[PDB]
Design an enzyme around this catalytic site. Structure first.
Site, PDB file in Angstrom:
ATOM      1  N   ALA A 254      -8.637  -1.263   5.946  1.00 45.62           N
ATOM      2  CA  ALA A 254      -9.774  -0.483   5.099  1.00 45.62           C
ATOM      3  C   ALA A 254     -11.376  -0.145   5.819  1.00 45.62           C
ATOM      4  O   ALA A 254     -11.198   1.105   5.289  1.00 45.62           O
ATOM      5  CB  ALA A 254     -10.422  -2.243   4.411  1.00 45.62           C
TER       6      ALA A 254
ATOM      7  N   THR B 168       0.832  -1.238   0.054  1.00 45.84           N
ATOM      8  CA  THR B 168       0.500   0.017  -0.257  1.00 45.84           C
ATOM      9  C   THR B 168       1.004   1.429   0.457  1.00 45.84           C
ATOM     10  O   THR B 168       1.693   1.368   0.661  1.00 45.84           O
ATOM     11  CB  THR B 168      -0.945   0.228   1.140  1.00 45.84           C
ATOM     12  OG1 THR B 168      -1.842  -1.473   1.194  1.00 45.84           O
ATOM     13  CG2 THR B 168      -2.118   1.400   1.089  1.00 45.84           C
TER      14      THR B 168
END
EC number: 3.4.25.1
Lengths: 239, 213, 238, 228, 201, 240, 215
Positions: free
Chosen positions: E49, E1
């Protein structure tokens, strides 16, 4: 039916205690408020010194923020509570979203407070009516008023308290678009309103301005004397 | 001590086609090194256009199933219409975050039709995020099933292979073959296969057995 | 006449007049008729409107897959008891994983409406419930009252000018038990067409029919599956 | 007698809801007409002062991107219910990614239009008109203080609503167009208002299915008025 | 990420990858990370998330309510402040959240950076995630203020390419959003292998 | 008289009229009797159909509180339903905290105190009910109790609640109440209910009989009255 | 309950043609000491369903109390409606799940056997709320030991008679007496048909020890 209590409607569809609570506002001191183009100005009448005390505590015009100003009518104690609540609300908003408090937000707060305060169980509604004057967004002057019902209602000029029918009735056949401010014309408009007061005693006028960027200016009753003299000069020039 | 969780395992597949969403699952419910049953279908028919699969911890699967059924009936009996697929997806995401600090140990996959009449597979995670993908495999056999779907559905890593849209019967025989091939090497898979097909004409089912060990 | 003020007060004749006033508040609703066969329960109500252009206030509201109620009187208490009704239905549906028997649900309704008729601070519910359902022993047609004295019947009709309906139900309650859905439903509106003054006729847009069946899920109908029900009638014998 | 909410009449009825329906009547009028092309809506402001700034008085406020409103009578509850229904729409969108339909909006509103109770406050003093575009095209709904909520094709509220309804039933049918309905509404307005109709008296609100955003007309209103 | 964001003369550039793993196993390749709050605000997904998704949806709700009460857009600093105050009320309970808030202001460009640790700060460039340091390096090579539009596009695209090239936890489609004065518009969603074939020579 | 609005106020002579007015509310209610034999208690209620609308088997005033205790209410029906729920709750607490069947004396005392607490305060009204309580135990025999609207709760051999409260117990006391088993007492209750009010003010009544004792081995249920059909073939022989 | 004091042991249950037989033994071991060698571990619920449990015996008493209360309540409604065995299964599962969700678990392992309206029912409830149906259930070590016998014969023959099932239960309990340390040679058989609920007496087993003559 009857004026007690707040909850029950009339048999012809009215709330009495809201309608009776405005008579307290109408039976109080007089204060006007106008917005010029860049300077906003207001002031209470009837300073009413009693020769044996100070008057620096009895001030009816204060501020919640460095952008907003106060004014009111009706009885004083409710005004004290509403202002002391409004300051805390202004700072709590400042602790959130980091803007200076928009005048519309603080009027919605005060009107909403008073409104849910009115609907509730046997609580005495506040017999005041505020004038909330501020210029925040790009220096745009605004002034809103309240009601004991709690309906904020934006104006360009205002008159409350005693004789307010006539005190506002002066403002149509004085208030032009022209021009503009022209801060001197705004000041002279305030002076025409103060000379248009129900008494206009000469010394009982206390007006305070804001030039939309500074803090509040408290005036001095020699400048106001020159203002009354030049108003009398224009009145003699009318002859 | 007391453990709140146990791994029951299981396998959930989903394929979003052009106008169909095929969700299949085995019916083996196990624990540790035992078999509790050989019939426990992970599929649940919510609407005429939405089928949900739930694997992982079996008790939380049951609880979540019943809560979803309750809120389905609430929305319908309040607003005169059934939910969409994405509405159910958003609702499930809200629920799974609503128990953030005591998580469900549950993988979830919702298939069904959109409002265009096309397939939509909404994957999930145990904490409550989601996304509209074309195929997902949930459970212990996830790693045994994703790359083959990448080879066939995604057509990835290939050369000069054109892209045919995924038809129905092709997808059906693919599902049968991936479950055989995954049941050969996995210990949490077998004994049946519960295939649910969502068309524009209702929900069909089909049962295909597997090897019995 | 000062004893006729509040729910708490017993009269010096023992008849608490708030309950009677609630009954008369029920009597100013729309007319509605509920009746069962051995296998199918049908309740049919009447819609009314505020003006011509406005839509019609609906009376039959769905509750559950096998439970449906009619109503008469107030709408706020109607929707409140609707919310409580659906709540109890889904609660037992969640716990026991079964549909409810109807009688225990209506006893819960009585125990719900008991407290606002006993203490101070809440009025009795002006309400006109006609409940249809299916437990293991078939269809049921119950009625409530604002005095919570819930009844079981085989053909009831409550509302405004509901009495001619009751006479019709009296002279055909022997005939009711044998027939299938079609002429049962037309007996129901052969009560409703005497719940009306005779110079106007029951059209489509003013009537509402709700069937529950032993194998048939509870379903509301309006004008479009009601045009199959409104044909098959004669005129009134003028 | 009748003195509060916890008491019926001998014949019916309360007698507090009745006084709420009475208290509607003091407010200003408004007229909304559902057309299949879209919902049009009009109101009268009753402006008192020239210092009274006209765009600061709200009658038509915004609930959703496709759900308008109009208010009546007592301004107070007409602010309270708006501030609730806005949140309600947002809760619905939040947990559902979609637009709460107008009937469901008004169900959310009338679930506490009458939850009036001081123990276990007073009933509200506003009639509302709700217009919006659901999946079934345009929708126009009319509620009341009593919660007895219905759909109306073309409803007229508040003051002078009797002749409004009569002359409205004179002109309306099911196959109207948009601009005809707009001018038909303001004809009824300038037959029930008292002052001259101009750029500052009334304000329109037109929501179309292809023009969901901005359900409003600003100073093309002048052009619409001068076409009579 | 790996996400990054930098503002310049003609607005704000926001780019990120699309790979979201699960431990040592890759869950998906096309996880849309730049969470679109408004037609005027853009939020990201930086670490975790559920927390990013949930709390930015709640912030979107709050912004919509604020607008419908004041008939006027909210500022960027306001939204960042509200998000930090909401997130702070679960500190120490185990929330991981490192998102960014971008949008156009009455002041103009706005770029804040809100952490689950509460590090609400302004700035000019930012980069969040595991391979964020790679983006810091190549970005602060290429950074200026007077850049052009295609030039800043190539900067961000090159930056995310380097980031996904050296880190293991990054890859997938390269999202690239561009904030304007009037409103944000997606630039492109490009694959890494296409970038490798294109920029490798 | 006047002096009678609140349930908390006294009178200048010293009684509470709310209690009185609630007592004579049950006076208009249906006739309900009860009598106990030497090995059981038999209930019986004169129950009336309204006109033709009922179903012969609705709204049964013969309740059933515990496995061996059930009520025979008279008065306002829904208040009696709520009172039955309170009694069921009390018996369930006793079963859960002590593991055995409730003794009837303690049950009656708890329920009477609950009724009394409703008679006390000003926010609430007194109950408009009067009900019977019957039991049977192998260690206790048969007990028949009685609760007024006020809450004065003691025991009887026989009782009657309704219109014919005196007019039933004029000839309830001429029964040979001890030396009979309850299967005689069934048709006794039949003839007692059938004597009062056949056609005079109203049209039609209908008979229900509850039934507890040793013959049910401690169970409490309604008779199979249709079995042995004891009323009508004896009722038609009691008109002469 | 964090620490189970007094455990029972394995419970065996299997359907047959129009009925379900359950049999568990009568041992109340604490630690390794068989402190309570005469107790009942099967409650006879009203007329159709029937309960058998393992684990903490006090929790089983508590559930006995609550279910007896519920069944008496519904019977005193007088409406002619009882609980299905599946409704009992559902309620027990919800109760166990809500009890563990508050981190205070009921240490139990329960089997609900019932026959209602033609269809037999045989349900399982775990401590964690894990619950399912099965043609044959075995708890504790019985799921390790006697479960292959059930799944052998039910794969060999999907339906059974009452006699065949009773014999198979006897053999499985004999096997459990052989190689379970928490076993005891006194068990009771419970049987439900449409003729009601019937609990048999404390039967015993017949053992073999002829291998002991080998070295």
């Amino acid at each position: 039916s009857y004026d007690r209590a707040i909850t029950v409607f009339s048999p012809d569809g009215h709330l009495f205690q809201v309608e009776y609570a405005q008579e307290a506002v109408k039976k109080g001191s007089t204060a006007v408020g106008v917005r010029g183009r860049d300077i906003v100005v207001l002031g209470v009448e009837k300073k009413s010194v009693a020769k044996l005390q100070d008057e620096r505590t009895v001030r009816k015009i204060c501020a919640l923020d460095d952008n907003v100003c106060m004014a009111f009518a009706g009885l004083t104690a409710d005004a004290r509570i509403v202002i002391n609540r409004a300051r805390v609300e202004c700072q709590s908003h400042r602790l959130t979203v980091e803007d200076p408090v928009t005048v519309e937000y603080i009027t919605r707060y005060i009107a909403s407070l008073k409104q849910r305060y009115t609907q509730s169980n046997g609580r005495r509604p506040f017999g005041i009516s505020a004038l909330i004057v501020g210029f925040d967004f790009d220096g745009t002057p605004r002034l809103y008023q309240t009601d004991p019902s709690g309906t904020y209602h934006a104006w360009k000029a205002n008159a409350i308290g005693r004789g307010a029918k006539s005190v506002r009735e002066f403002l149509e056949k004085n208030y032009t678009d022209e021009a503009i401010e022209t801060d001197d014309l705004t000041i002279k408009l305030v002076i025409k309103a103060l000379l248009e007061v129900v008494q206009s005693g000469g010394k009982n006028i206390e007006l305070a301005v804001m030039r939309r960027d500074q803090s509040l200016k408290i005036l001095n009753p020699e400048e106001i004397e020159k203002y009354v003299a030049e108003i009398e000069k224009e009145k003699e020039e009318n002859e | 001590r007391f453990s709140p969780y146990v791994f029951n395992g299981g396998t959930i597949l989903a394929i979003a086609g052009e106008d169909f969403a095929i969700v299949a699952s085995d019916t083996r419910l196990s624990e540790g090194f035992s078999i509790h049953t050989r019939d426990s279908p992970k599929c649940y028919k919510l609407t005429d256009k939405t089928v949900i699969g739930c694997s992982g911890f079996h008790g939380d699967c049951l609880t979540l199933t019943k809560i979803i059924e309750a809120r389905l009936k609430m929305y319908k009996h309040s607003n005169n219409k059934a939910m969409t697929t994405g509405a159910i997806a958003a609702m499930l995401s809200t629920i799974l975050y609503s128990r953030r600090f005591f998580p469900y140990y549950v993988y979830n996959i919702i298939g069904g039709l959109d409002e265009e009449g096309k397939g939509a597979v909404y994957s999930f995670d145990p904490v409550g995020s989601y996304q509209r993908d074309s195929f997902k495999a949930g459970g212990s056999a996830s790693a045994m099933l994703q790359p083959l779907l990448d080879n066939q559905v995604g057509f990835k890593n290939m050369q000069n292979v054109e892209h045919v849209p995924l038809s129905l019967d092709r997808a059906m025989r693919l599902v049968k073959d991936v479950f055989i091939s995954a049941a050969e090497r996995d210990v949490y898979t077998g004994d049946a296969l519960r295939i649910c097909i969502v068309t524009k004409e209702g929900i069909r089912e089909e049962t295909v057995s597997l090897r019995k060990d | 006449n000062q004893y006729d003020n509040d729910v708490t007060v017993w009269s010096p004749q023992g008849r608490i007049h708030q309950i009677e006033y609630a009954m008369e508040a029920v009597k100013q609703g729309s007319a509605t008729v509920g009746l069962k066969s051995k296998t199918h329960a049908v309740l049919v109500a009447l819609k009314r409107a505020q003006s011509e252009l406005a839509a019609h206030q609906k009376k039959i509201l769905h509750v559950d897959n096998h439970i449906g109620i009619s109503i008469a009187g107030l709408t706020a208490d109607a929707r409140l008891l609707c919310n409580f009704m659906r709540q109890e239905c889904l609660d037992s549906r969640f716990v026991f994983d079964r549909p409810l028997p109807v009688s225990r649900l209506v006893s819960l309704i009585g125990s719900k409406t008991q407290i606002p008729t006993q203490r101070y601070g809440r009025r009795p519910y002006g309400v006109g419930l006609l409940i249809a359902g299916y437990d293991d022993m078939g269809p049921h047609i119950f009625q409530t009252c604002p005095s919570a004295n819930y009844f079981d019947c085989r053909a009831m009709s409550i509302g405004a000018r509901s009495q001619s309906a009751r006479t019709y139900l009296e002279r055909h309650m022997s005939e009711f038990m044998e027939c299938n859905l079609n002429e049962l439903v037309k007996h129901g509106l052969r009560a409703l067409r005497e719940t009306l003054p005779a110079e106007q006729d029951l059209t489509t847009k003013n009537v509402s029919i709700g069937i529950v069946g032993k194998d048939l899920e509870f379903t509301i109908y309006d004008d479009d599956d009601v045009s199959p029900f409104l044909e098959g009638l004669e005129e009134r014998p003028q | 007698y009748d003195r509060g909410v916890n008491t019926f009449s001998p014949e019916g009825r309360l007698f507090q809801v009745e006084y709420a329906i009475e208290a509607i009547k003091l407010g200003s009028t408004a007229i909304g007409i559902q057309t299949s092309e879209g919902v049009c809506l009009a109101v009268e402001k009753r402006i008192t002062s020239p210092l009274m700034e006209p765009s600061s008085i709200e009658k038509i406020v915004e609930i959703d991107a496709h759900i308008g409103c109009a208010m009546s009578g007592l301004i107070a509850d007409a602010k309270t219910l708006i501030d609730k229904a806005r949140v309600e729409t947002q809760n619905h969108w939040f947990t559902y990614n979609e637009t709460m339909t107008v009937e469901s909006v008004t169900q959310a509103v009338s679930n506490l239009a009458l939850q009036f109770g001081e123990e276990d406050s007073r009933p509200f003093g506003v009639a509302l008109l709700f217009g919006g575009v659901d999946e079934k095209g345009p929708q126009l709904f009319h509620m009341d203080p009593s919660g007895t909520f219905v759909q109306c094709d073309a409803r007229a509220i508040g003051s002078a609503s009797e002749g409004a309804q009569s002359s409205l039933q004179e002109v309306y049918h099911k196959s109207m167009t948009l601009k005809e309905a707009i001018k038909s509404s303001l004809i009824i307005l300038k037959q029930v208002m008292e002052e001259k109709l101009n750029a500052t008296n009334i304000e329109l609100a037109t929501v179309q299915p292809g023009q969901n955003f901005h359900m409003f007309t600003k100073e093309e209103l002048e052009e619409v008025i001068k076409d009579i | 990420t790996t996400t990054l964001a930098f503002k310049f003369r003609h607005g704000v550039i926001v780019a990120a990858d699309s790979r979201a793993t699960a431990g040592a196993y890759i869950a998906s390749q096309t996880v849309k990370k730049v969470i679109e709050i408004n037609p005027y605000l853009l939020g990201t997904m930086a670490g975790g998330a559920a927390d990013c998704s949930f709390w930015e949806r709640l912030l979107a709700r709050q912004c919509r309510i604020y607008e419908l009460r004041n008939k006027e857009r909210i500022s960027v600093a306001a939204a960042s402040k509200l998000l930090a105050n909401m997130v702070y009320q679960y500190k120490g309970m185990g929330l991981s959240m490192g998102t960014m808030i971008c949008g156009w202001d009455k002041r103009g460009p706005g770029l804040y950076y809100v952490d689950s640790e509460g590090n609400r700060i302004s700035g000019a460039t930012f980069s969040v995630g595991s391979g964020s340091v790679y983006a810091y390096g190549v970005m602060d090579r290429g950074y200026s203020y007077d850049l052009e539009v295609e030039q800043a596009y190539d900067l961000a695209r090159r930056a995310i390419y380097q980031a996904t090239y050296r880190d293991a936890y990054s890859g997938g489609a390269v999202n690239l959003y561009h904030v304007r004065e009037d409103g944000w518009i997606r630039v492109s969603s490009d694959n890494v292998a296409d970038l490798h074939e294109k920029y490798s020579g | 008289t006047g002096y009678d609005l609140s349930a908390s106020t006294f009178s200048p002579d010293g009684r509470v009229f709310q209690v009185e007015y609630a007592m004579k509310a049950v006076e208009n209610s249906s006739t309900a009797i009860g009598i106990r034999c030497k090995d059981g208690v038999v209930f019986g209620v004169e129950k009336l159909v309204l006109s033709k609308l009922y179903e012969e088997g609705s709204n049964k005033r013969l309740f059933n509180v515990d496995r061996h205790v059930g009520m025979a209410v008279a008065g306002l029906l829904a208040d009696a339903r709520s009172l039955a729920d309170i009694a069921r709750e009390e018996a369930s607490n006793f079963r859960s905290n002590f593991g055995y069947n409730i003794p009837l004396k303690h049950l009656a005392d708890r329920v009477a105190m609950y009724v009394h607490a409703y008679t006390l305060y000003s926010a609430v009204r007194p109950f408009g009910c009067s009900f019977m309580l019957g039991s049977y135990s192998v260690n206790d025999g048969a007990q028949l109790y009685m609760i007024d609207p006020s809450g004065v709760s003691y025991g009887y051999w026989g009782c009657a609640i309704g219109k014919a409260r005196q007019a039933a117990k004029t000839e309830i006391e001429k029964l040979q109440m001890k030396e009979m088993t309850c299967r005689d007492i069934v048709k006794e209750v039949a003839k007692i209910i059938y004597i009062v009010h056949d056609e005079v003010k109203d049209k039609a009544f209908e008979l229900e009989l509850s039934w507890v004792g040793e013959l049910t081995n401690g169970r409490h249920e309604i008779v199979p009255k249709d079995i042995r059909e004891e009323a009508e073939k004896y009722a038609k022989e009691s008109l002469k | 309950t964090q620490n189970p004091m007094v455990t029972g042991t394995s419970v065996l249950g299997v359907k047959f043609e129009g009925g379900v037989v359950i049999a568990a033994d009568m041992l109340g071991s604490y630690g390794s000491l068989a402190r309570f060698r005469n107790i009942s571990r099967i409650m006879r619920v009203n007329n159709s369903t029937m309960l058998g449990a393992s684990g903490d015996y006090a929790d089983f008493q508590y559930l006995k109390q609550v279910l007896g209360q519920m069944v008496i309540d519904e019977e005193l409604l007088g409406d002619g409606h009882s609980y299905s065995p599946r409704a009992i299964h559902s309620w027990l599962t919800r109760a166990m799940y809500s009890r563990r969700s508050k981190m205070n678990p009921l240490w139990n392992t329960m089997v609900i056997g019932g026959y209602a309206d033609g269809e037999s029912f045989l349900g399982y409830v775990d401590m964690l709320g894990v619950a399912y149906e099965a043609p044959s259930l075995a708890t504790g070590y019985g799921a390790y030991l006697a479960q292959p016998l059930l799944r052998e014969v039910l794969e060999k023959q999907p339906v059974l008679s009452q006699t065949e099932a009773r014999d198979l239960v006897e053999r499985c309990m004999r096997v459990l007496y052989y190689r379970d340390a928490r076993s005891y040679n006194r068990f009771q058989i419970a049987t439900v048909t449409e003729k009601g609920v019937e609990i048999e007496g404390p039967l015993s087993t017949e053992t073999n020890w002829d291998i002991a003559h080998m070295i």
